[model samples]
Target chain A: MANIVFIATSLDGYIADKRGKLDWLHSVPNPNNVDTGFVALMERVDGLVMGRNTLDMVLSFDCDWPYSKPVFVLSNTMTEVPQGYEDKVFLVKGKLVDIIADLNAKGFNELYIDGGVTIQNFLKEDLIDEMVITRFPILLGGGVPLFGELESSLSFNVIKSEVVLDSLTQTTYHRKR
Target chain B: ENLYFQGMANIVFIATSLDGYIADKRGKLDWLHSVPNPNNVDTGFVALMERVDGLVMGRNTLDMVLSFDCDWPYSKPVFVLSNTMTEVPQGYEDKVFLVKGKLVDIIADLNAKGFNELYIDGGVTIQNFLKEDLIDEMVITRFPILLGGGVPLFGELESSLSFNVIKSEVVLDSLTQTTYHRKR
Candidate 1:
């Protein structure tokens, strides 16, 4: 019944490394190469919301499509969901609030907001309710940031933090508002 | 008993928001106390204080500490790194000392004073020490809030320094305190 964010980042708060590479995510060996936290998040979320760049990035992945829930991609530039993902992905265009209201009206009460830009937009509007950020022990120093400039500060209270894989620390936070 | 000159270890023990901000955009720190610490347990501050031989910070950080309503927050001597200041205030005498010149020379002088395990504090001071490749260890505790903007914990270095995690603990089930050793 709320908009949630689940993302992995470097200790310095970068989503991708300085070269915009996500290879650092594999710094700690998982053995199984599984993303348990992300899997758990997908279960909790009823739908997915992302921006065009995120949609394009996902399309470029070598692996198969990764979601069971509907993916609502916000893009005025993208007229349609890439050819084959019509059933798997949908195009959304308009004000974030309006789009959220429309999605809720369509039974997407629990939305999982993904993508760096999309998350930043939601944060700017104070639209996020919960965030589960798992930080890797390594610091990228600089990269595509998970956070950006906000006109005002947004406060969130820590709900829990768990150390996983013997290295990474996963923390959950609920917006203070 | 043997008295040997142990190699100096410069360390950093500090906290930052999820966005890497030590303070808010307004240069305020009220958000740091927003965490609900019902048990009022120590977030390993005492242990860090006990481990470090002395503290080093910039003039701005020293000034901020002096303006605090509470008494002097440090039990160990705090070395102020400032080229502009000639001397510390009368009340802070013995508690705070001014050190100038290159970071390496200043560190060597402190080491000669038996202050080997230095806890480098303040954003600018830590960044300067990092620029000189002087940091030996760093213990960074993260608060679960995104301050959006303000004093960042790290600045641009001449080259990126690599580190290996020593250990990490989730304090009060909210904050994560992780210790790292600069990989040689």
Candidate 2:
């Protein structure tokens, strides 16, 4: 089975902010303005996972990059994909293991996961194989917290980490075998 | 501290956040490592742990904490608060507990059971606790990091409670910790 990886950033105490906006994320921009680590990780992935709110944010962005890979949005309400991205978007409402099984059956090996709530679900289920959290400087004070409310404990191995000046730090962890 | 025990119940909250967000927003945590130390403030939490003898968490937090594979930090009793509680690993059966009830009522019942302090935890649970004033205190340490977005600490509030900044400290690892006491 291919491993699932999560590459993202968060604030200390993990608080998003007062309004739940990530505008401060750019403060720690990976020196090059592009997260090459994330870009590289995406190269081996065949699927993308996100939540309803994340999709909304994507729509909010007027970017023109075409997400050539298959995208799955986990939602309880909307089922049909939106107008422009209909061909690649799929609404999923099932167990994590089952969903992974379905995706794997379809010949997907690597996956890039995003969205706070969705990531929470995957982490709680122990479905993600690796997590790369980039720490940026600033606190939203409120908003959607990354880790969802859960019922048990989770374990991971810190594979790598680095400090970027005084503004940001990045760490990657792999699911313990 | 023991005087407030009569009508208090404990709830373990798992703050869902991105990274070092709180610190960058505020200069409060200037003492800790400049980046990625998890804003390990041990004020209200320590007080709560000394008081409340239980916990409440969401499935995500419960699973994430378990993945650490370390000794249980919390010596007090616990209850992984969740609407659905099936996915918990069997290994945590002895120490970890579960609560499935309307938050308010269950807290009252637990309070009646002699829970002097309530540790309202977990992002949703903390929000729920704050929504109902069940959370008498929320000591949030601002870590210096901007994740741009992701899960947050608390969403909204029911009312407002005055708090006293009890103490502050700058630890060795660049962790600036603080404590807050909610006024009843």
Candidate 3:
């Protein structure tokens, strides 16, 4: 069965600053553990999904598509093809479940989902299987908010929590089965 | 003469490292979780920026800042300092300054105009200014936690730099605040 995981950096409750910048997370300290963990997760993933805003950020950073696995970006306003990106990169539109089913039929196994807004919507659809949130110290008083327009409560099981360097703390949870 | 400016019109930015560390080998932000009360600090941070002039950030900040779906909160000029620049926010016809050159030179030109306070922000730029001895004062409120890895305060400083501690305070939740000014 395909599983979806959400890994994110957040302050107390928000993911971005007033400008939608994540400058507040400037203090997670050492990424060694997280990097190793992410790599392991990616290895298990056959497909990746993100929102247009996240795609724009990836472009701005000059980061190559890190995943050798296929990637899809959801957008409604794309007329021109995203330059320098090949077929592995797709602009997915249409119904979310239909898209997921189509991709899965194509032999793509586990899906690694990302982007704040996209994750929120996926959670609304009850699609996410697990959430791994790494909390960093630092406050960005204003910017983009993390969880916005969440109309109802969603419960999760706290699978694990670890404190690192006495400076950072991490928690992982599985959406209720 | 060494360039100098004062409060009000000056752009005093609040730029720090994610974990005070720039990048991991994998190029992700796993190191930023070390600090305590990361959420509250952001609220306090913006409250302080309310008094400062416009914000000036590097390409990295711009990369992250442009992702949100809100207007650029401040009406003041928001400059993006980078070699590779693209797309400007609407209605910021004259407000947004995209400059590619020495930061000091850019500030000098802006200062020549009516713009007074320059909020020196971003990790690399802040470190560069400290090394250049350009920063006049800095208000760093060190949180209780530390980022074991991530970008540091001064990335490429050549020599040791010192600042006079102007003031210090501890907030309600063990947040330690320290203000510093460059020795004249």
Best by DockQ: 1
Cα lDDT of model 3 by residue, B7-117, tens digit: 423333342332233443344444334334555556346654665566667776555555457456565677778777765666555756787788677777767675556
Report the Cα lDDT for residue A89, model 3: 79
RMSD in order of candidates: 3.2, 14.0, 15.9
lDDT of 2 by residue, A61-166 (tens): 7786346688888777787888878777888877878887888898876778888788878876768777766544343344556664445334444555555443
Chain B TM-score, one value per candidate, order as shown: 0.93, 0.69, 0.73
Chain A only TM-scores, each candidate in turn: 0.95, 0.86, 0.85
DockQ comparisons of all candidates to the true complex: 0.46, 0.05, 0.02
DockQ of 2: 0.05
Using DockQ as the measure, what is the rank order of every candidate, best first?
1, 2, 3
- lDDT over C-alpha atoms for residue B133 of model 3: 62
Judge the docking of candidate 1 as incorrect, acceptable, medium or high: acceptable
Ten contiguous residues minimizing lDDT sum, candidate 1 chain A? A135-144
Worst 10 residues of 2 chain A by lDDT: A7-16
Relative to the unseen true structure, what is the C-alpha lDDT of residue B126 in candidate 1, on a scale of 0 to 100? 85
| lDDT string, candidate 1, B1-184, tens digits | 1112256788888989878988887788898786778777887789889988999999878887886375998999999998899987878898998888888788878888889888899999987887777778888888877778899988765444667777877776667788888776
Q: Indicate the docking level reached by candidate 3.
A: incorrect
Off by over 4 Å in 2: A3-7, A13-16, A29-36, B1-184
| Candidate 2 second chain TM | 0.69
The alpha-carbon root-mean-square deviation between model 1 and the true structure, to one decimal in Å, is 3.2
TM-score of each: 0.89, 0.49, 0.47
Residue pairs with backbone atoms closer than 3 Å in model 1 (clashes): none
